[PDB]
Design a protein around this ligand. Structure first.
Ligand code: HEM
Ligand code: HEM
Ligand SMILES: O=N[O-]
Ligand SMILES: O=N[O-]
Ligand SMILES: O=N[O-]
Ligand SMILES: O=N[O-]
Lengths: 141, 146, 141, 146
C-alpha cells in the first residue's frame, strides 16, 4: 500500500529524473547484467555489451512501463496487466530477478539524484518498485 | 570470494575515498528506514519514529561506524571473509538470530549509499565489484547458519 | 491472482482439513520453530516446547485467519487489514518469515492430506498462502 | 552442515525408506508445476502444459532420478557437501546460471514430497533435520556463486 507521502515522493523523483528516464533505464539494465550475471540468460539474443542499442532500446521500454505505473499508481494491476502476462507466462521470469532489477534501478537513481535520493524518497521508491514487482509476478499467485 | 584484480582495483580505489565516520551510519539509518522490520533489533537506540529521527540519531551513527569498520576489515581480507567474520557470524546468527536475508539487504543499502555519495564515479563495473564484496560478506556473516 | 481453479482447489483442501484446522495450525508453528529457529525470536514470551498450550492457542488463531481469508478470498486485503497492520507495524515481522510459515503450512497439509495434496492442489495452496503473505506484508509497500 | 547424531538418525532412517526411483521425479515435477518459471530450464522435456502432463512426463521422472541420486550422495557425505557438489555447482552456477533461490525451492518441494509420502512419520523434528540437509545442499550447489 503506497501512502500519499510515498506517491508524492515517487512523483517528485520521477519529475527530477525528467527526460533522462530512458537513459537511466538502460543504465539500470547494464548494472543488472554486470552485477547479477544470471539475469543475462533472459536476453541470450540481445547484445549486452556496453553501448548496445538493444539495451538502450529496452531501457526505454522499461522506463516507459515504470512511468505508466507512476501515472496510474492507483490502478497498477490493470495498467501492468499485459506486462504481467508477458513476464510470467511467456518469459517465465524468476521472481527473484525483479528484486535485482529493482535494486539496480534504485542504485541508478541514487547515482543521478544527489538531492532527491533522501532516506525518505529511497524508502518510497523501494516500495514503488516492490509494488510494481508484485504486480509483474502476480500471474504466479 | 575471488575478485579479479580489476574488481579489486575498483573496490580498493573507491574505498579509500569513503568517509568511514559517516557512510556506516548512513547505510544503517537507511536500512532502518527502508526495511523497518530491522528496527526490531535496535529498540535501544531510541527515537526511530521518522526518517529524520533515525538519520539524526547519534546511536545509529555510532553503531554504523562499527558496522563499516567490519566491512573495511572484510575488504582487507577478501580471500578469507569466512575467518574474518567468524565472530560476527556467531553473534548475528547464534545470539541475535538475524535472518541472513537482512545481511544481503544492508549490503545492497550500502551499495545505494556508495552510489548516492559517488554518483557517476560509481560505475556499473564498480557496482558489480562491490556486489561481489557485499555478497561475500553476507555469506560469511551467515556461515554459522550453514 | 488466484484462478477459479485455484479457488476451487483451496476450498477443497480446507474442506478436507475440516475441523482439524486449528490443530494443523499449531503443528505448522511447531514445524516452523524447530526448522527455522530464527522465527522463535518473535515469541520470546511464549513457551515453545512441544505441547505448549500457547502454541496450540496461537495455531488456532492462525488457522482462523487463513479460513477467514479463504472465506473472503476475493477481498483478502480488506479481510486481513487489521492483521496486516499488526504484523508490519507492531510486530515488525520480517517478510522472509512468511515464506517460512507458508512452507510449514504446506508441509503440514501434505503430511495430513494424502489424497488431497496433489501437484495441482499443492500449486493452488502455494499461491493462496503467497497471496495471504503478500497482504500481511503489504504495510511494507 | 553439522547434523547432531539425533538429526543424522532422523535423516538416515527415513531415507532408507525412500523410493529412489520415484521421489526425485515427484519433487522435480512439483517444482515445475508449483514454480512454473523453473520450466524455463527444461524446455527439452516436452509437454509441460498441465500438471498431469508434467507428472506423467517420462523425462521428468528420469531426470528427477538423477537429481535424487545427487541428494543421496550428499546424505552420504554430510560433513563435506562442498566437495560432493563441486561439479554440480560448476554446472548449475557457471553453465546453467540457475538462480540459487531455486535450489532452496527444490529442497523445500522435496520436503513437501517426503511429508506427503511419509505423513505423520515426517514429524516436526524429522522435518527440521531435513531442512538442515536441504539448506546444506542448496548452499553447496551455490558455492560457485560465493
Ligand atoms: C550485513 C553486514 C553486517 C555487519 C558487517 C555487521 C556488523 C556488526 C558489528 C561490527 C557489530 C558490533 C559487534 C560488537 O560490538 O563487537 C554489530 C552488532 C549488531 N548487529 Fe550487525 N552487522 C551486519 C548486519 C546486521 C543486520 C542486518 C542486523 C539486524 C537487522 C544486525 C543487528 C545487530 C545488532 C542488534 C547488534 C548489537 C548486538 C549486541 O550489541 O549485542 N546486524 N554488527
Ligand atoms: C537444488 C538441488 C539440485 C540438485 C541436487 C540437482 C541435481 C542435478 C543433477 C544430478 C543433474 C544431472 C547432471 C549430469 O547429467 O551430470 C542436473 C542437471 C540439470 N539441472 Fe539440476 N539439480 C538441482 C537444482 C536445479 C534447479 C532448481 C534447476 C532449475 C530450475 C536445475 C536445472 C538443471 C538443468 C537444466 C540440468 C540439465 C543440464 C544439462 O544437461 O546440461 N537444477 N541437476
Ligand atoms: O528489463 N526488464 O525487462
Ligand atoms: O548493522 N547492524 O549491525
Ligand atoms: O504465527 N503467526 O502468527
Ligand atoms: O533438478 N533439476 O536438476
Amino acid at each position: 500500500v503506497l501512502s500519499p507521502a510515498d506517491k508524492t515522493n515517487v512523483k517528485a523523483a520521477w519529475g527530477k529524473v525528467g527526460a533522462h528516464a530512458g537513459e537511466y533505464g538502460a543504465e539500470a539494465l547494464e548494472r543488472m547484467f554486470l552485477s547479477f550475471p544470471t539475469t543475462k540468460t533472459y536476453f541470450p539474443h540481445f547484445d549486452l555489451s556496453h553501448g548496445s542499442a538493444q539495451v538502450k532500446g529496452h531501457g526505454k521500454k522499461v522506463a516507459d512501463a515504470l512511468t505508466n505505473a507512476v501515472a496510474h499508481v492507483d490502478d497498477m494491476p490493470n495498467a501492468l496487466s499485459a506486462l504481467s502476462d508477458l513476464h510470467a507466462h511467456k518469459l517465465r521470469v524468476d521472481p527473484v530477478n525483479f528484486k535485482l532489477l529493482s535494486h539496480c534501478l534504485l542504485v541508478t537513481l541514487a547515482a543521478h539524484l544527489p538531492a532527491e535520493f533522501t532516506p525518505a524518497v529511497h524508502a518510497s521508491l523501494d516500495k514503488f518498485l516492490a509494488s510494481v514487482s508484485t504486480v509483474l509476478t502476480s500471474k504466479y499467485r | 570470494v575471488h575478485l579479479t584484480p580489476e574488481e579489486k582495483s575498483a573496490v580498493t580505489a573507491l574505498w579509500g575515498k569513503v568517509n568511514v565516520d559517516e557512510v556506516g551510519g548512513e547505510a544503517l539509518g537507511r536500512l532502518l528506514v527502508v526495511y523497518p522490520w530491522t528496527q526490531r533489533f535496535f529498540e535501544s537506540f531510541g527515537d526511530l519514529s521518522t526518517p529524520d529521527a533515525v538519520m539524526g540519531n547519534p546511536k545509529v551513527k555510532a553503531h554504523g561506524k562499527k558496522v563499516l569498520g567490519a566491512f573495511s576489515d572484510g575488504l582487507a581480507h577478501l580471500d578469507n571473509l569466512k575467518g574474518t567474520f567468524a565472530t560476527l557470524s556467531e553473534l548475528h546468527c547464534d545470539k541475535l538470530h538475524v535472518d541472513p536475508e537482512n545481511f544481503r539487504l544492508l549490503g545492497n543499502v550500502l551499495v545505494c549509499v556508495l552510489a548516492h555519495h559517488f554518483g557517476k564515479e560509481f560505475t556499473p563495473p564498480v557496482q558489480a565489484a562491490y556486489q561481489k564484496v557485499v555478497a561475500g560478506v553476507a555469506n560469511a556473516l551467515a556461515h554459522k547458519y550453514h
